[PDB]
Amino acid sequence: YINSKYKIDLDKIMTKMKNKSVINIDDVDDEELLAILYTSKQFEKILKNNEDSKYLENKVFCSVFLEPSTRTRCSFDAAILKLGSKVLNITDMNSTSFYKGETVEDAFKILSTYVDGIIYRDPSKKNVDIAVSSSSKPIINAGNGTGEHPTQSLLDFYTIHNYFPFILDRNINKKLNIAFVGDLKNGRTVHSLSKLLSRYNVSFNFVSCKSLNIPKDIVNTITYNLKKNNFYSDDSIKYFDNLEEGLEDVHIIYMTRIQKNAFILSNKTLENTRDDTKILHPLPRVNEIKVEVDSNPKSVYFTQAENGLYVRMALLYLIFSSTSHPQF
Amino acid sequence: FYINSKYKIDLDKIMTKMKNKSVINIDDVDDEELLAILYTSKQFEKILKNNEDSKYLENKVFCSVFLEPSTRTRCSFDAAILKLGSKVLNITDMNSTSFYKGETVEDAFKILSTYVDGIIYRDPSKKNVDIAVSSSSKPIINAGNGTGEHPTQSLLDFYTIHNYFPFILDRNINKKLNIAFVGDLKNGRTVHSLSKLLSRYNVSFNFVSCKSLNIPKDIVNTITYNLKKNNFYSDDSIKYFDNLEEGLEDVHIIYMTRIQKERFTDVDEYNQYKNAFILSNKTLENTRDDTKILHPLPRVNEIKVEVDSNPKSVYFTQAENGLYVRMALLYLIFSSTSSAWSHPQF
Amino acid sequence: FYINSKYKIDLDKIMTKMKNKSVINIDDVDDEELLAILYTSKQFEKILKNNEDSKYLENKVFCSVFLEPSTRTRCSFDAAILKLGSKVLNITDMNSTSFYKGETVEDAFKILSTYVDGIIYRDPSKKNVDIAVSSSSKPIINAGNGTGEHPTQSLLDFYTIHNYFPFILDRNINKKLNIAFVGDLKNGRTVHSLSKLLSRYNVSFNFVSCKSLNIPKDIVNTITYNLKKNNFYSDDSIKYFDNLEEGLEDVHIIYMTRIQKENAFILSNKTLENTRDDTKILHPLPRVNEIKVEVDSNPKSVYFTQAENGLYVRMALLYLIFSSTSSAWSHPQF
Ligand SMILES: CC(C)(C)OC(=O)Nc1sc(-c2ccccc2)cc1C(=O)NCCc1ccccc1
Ligand code: NA
């Protein structure tokens, strides 16, 4: 099992990931990240070539979405169904109507008797952690109020690694430069992907309009990670409030969502970027990216969204399998 | 493969043509495609009535997106997918505005179509379905929109008729089908769609309505051009009546529409129109012996419960037929390939 | 071949009788059918706790119709169908009036039953379930209605009891089970249903309630006629208390009910110290105050196992009604 230059011992990494709960991106170590990246790639190729995808038959999951949150929920459903497993849904409900005079711990202790695993989206942070403590079965966090969204970070990382595979090498001569653009204060997807990218040889351009800057405790978490692998320097973190400077010499531009510009992306504002730059956005997009950019080959935000299917298939396969592997 | 015992269906070739086809309007189905649908529907009807293996399409994952409540069509599409042995994720009980929460229809469909092999979409907006089709990398079946496009209702309507009157397929100048459309012909879009499809054949039409709720001119024009084009138009081709006693005479089919009180000024107008067009065993005594009664449902008072025991009533068979017709259409579009041994064949 | 310790089960014969049966009330289950359910439930419990293949009912497509919020029962029936290897479409987020949008219950059920092999139906109206059964070409499982019929709640309650006290099946005049029902005995319909089923056996009852919320006479009468039928009725058979201290003495089972206060009877480790060693505590759930979280660590608490058992009991009932099967070798036998 190879992804160019690293052999992955998938048997051994699955033994370790079996019945693992995934709440935060920090619950995924280096070895587990390689296994996910590798397996995601196998599912991408199997599905793009119309091959049998049914690597996880015989499982029954529960999907609990207590805010309307249709793309992430459908992505998890499709992944389960394409793997050949089954799922029952709780949707179109909020906290109060689902927990109708019942504790979170009662609800999860009972629900986990019915199913092999639970996928849970709840805008409360407390609820996901209470569910994990109460559940006899593994939980995948599909997004909560603390800004934990592990599968968004994983699919973001998979997407980058697909155009810039050298991010995995921890090579002091091969650095990736990324610009994060928009609302860096409220854009939790930046916070989570930053922590994961900072384990690697990466330098960051934070591009925001003063009022919406990256929070200090993320800058600190980036600086501790980069220091730990001896890739911190005074040039590791740069701050801009304009595109013209922010977007210069970055392999990746990652746009965030807003609501109420310095930061609208046009073919014009992209003429002076590297020819290899790729554009991500977790979606949905509003004005941050003009429709004309969809025809620009630097745009990969729809491939990115597509990649969430393969990454969620991979993560469900590695946690829930009982045991050959997807290959080719 | 034979239909009517006259017309040979090369299902391999017709599948190659229908593969990854979107079905939005009944005019997206040609003569050959309609034969393959009718034939395949009949095989699913017999396999299921005999408790045989129905799993002729197993490895597919669909998304079903219903942005207005419409329980029977949605459940019928679910059942069809599941009976074929495929899988479906559902968006229900939601409207346009809450599902498109500050996202364009084009963004939503471009992404959703990466997840799945095909989409079933019901939206009361007509624009939305056409935008979905333009944005989607995967086929769409329109399960109903605001323009009155509802191709699987028309298809299951036609399947039902063809089961009692198979000669409608022959385009034989000696073998004419006579149908009465009864009730709200202005707002009954199922009449509009079925009319267009029937007018490809040797058919004459009785439009039975009171003044205010008559068939629109643009449908009469489309029926008249279709009948002319196959040299079946005469001054007899389209008649208009305001009462059952005349309207229901010498028709093979009576097709009753919904007369929703919210289409009148008040109750007195409703209950006058109601009552004038209500179907009883009495109002059916001077129809042909062979007359069959359709209604797209749901039923309110348009038809009295006593008529359910009358052998001329088939509106519950009609609704059941939607399962077989939706199984057929899904099989023909989404199969990756054929053998002659992979086809349903009772 | 099919044994339940010392009851031999003729599953072929009992399935011939249960095939395409509708189950609306606990009285639609006779002695033989109850043994088939108990036996099949036990096989599913062991297969699933040992991670074996559970797919004993492939190729069916069900419709599950929930016209009130009723999340646990609905998820339990979904899980059961999916674990058996069959498929389901769901109608939820609906009440009576919005689902029957100017359509009769009989029209809706006549049509829906053409699509599917079976229907699971929860509706707070009692009329609706009985009209559904009259109109349907396919079998219905009642998942709960307004008359307090909830057959799979009673069945999973009974399965739970029989697991700790298997002698309830023997109808042995020397082996009596003592149960206390605690809380709102007037509105607690699962007491009503389980009482009727327990009273087919050698059972005595402690009804513990204030005064305003006492067991209704019609249930006392139905318990007395059942117990008389097997000559287990005596003036000792039914006792009435207004306090836990007396009510809870010498009972093998304590069954706590929901009381939505729309204080006397909260269960604590303290109020449990002088119960039998062997007493088990049920509660149909959800619980609010009736049982303190401290009791969850008490080994007498089984209300979470009880709720888990609903999976195995719903798998069993679906298998026994819907199987297309003939042969003794196809049945689960851990
Ligand atoms: C994290 C991801 C993107 C996977 O989660 C979803 O997609 N769910 C969500 S949270 C959301 C939102 C918007 C405003 C305020 C608060 C939350 C957008 C949405 C969302 O789904 N599209 C909004 C409208 C829409 C729904 C589905 C498809 C297309 C458009
Ligand atoms: Na599903």
Residue numbers in the entry:
A (entry chain A): 39 to 298, 312 to 374, 379 to 383
B (entry chain B): 38 to 383
C (entry chain C): 38 to 299, 312 to 383
Wording from the paper:
BDA-04 shows strong selectivity, with measured IC50s of 77.2 nM and 2.8 μM against PfATC and HsATC, respectively. To further characterize BDA-04, we then performed microscale thermophoresis (MST) that determined the Kd of BDA-04 as 66.3 nM. To characterize the mechanism of inhibition by BDAs, enzyme activity assays were performed using BDA-04 as an exemplar. This analysis indicates that BDA-04 acts as a noncompetitive inhibitor with CP and Asp. The terminal benzene side chain of BDA-04 is deeply buried in this hydrophobic area formed by the α3 helix, α4 helix, and β1–3 sheets from an adjacent subunit. The Boc moiety of BDA-04 partially occludes the CP binding domain. However, in the BDA-04:PfATC complex, Ser135 and Lys138 shift out of the CP binding site as the 120 s loop is blocked by BDA-04. BDA-04 therefore inhibits PfATCase allosterically, by stabilizing PfATC in inactive state that indirectly blocks the binding and recognition of CP.
Aspartate transcarbamoylase (ATC) catalyzes the second step of de novo pyrimidine synthesis, combining l-aspartate (l-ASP) and carbamoyl phosphate (CP) to form carbamoyl-aspartate (CP-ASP) and phosphate. Aspartate transcarbamoylase (ATC) has been suggested to be a promising target for antimalarial drug development. Here, we describe a series of small-molecule inhibitors of P. falciparum ATC with low nanomolar binding affinities that selectively bind to a previously unreported allosteric pocket, thereby inhibiting ATC activation.
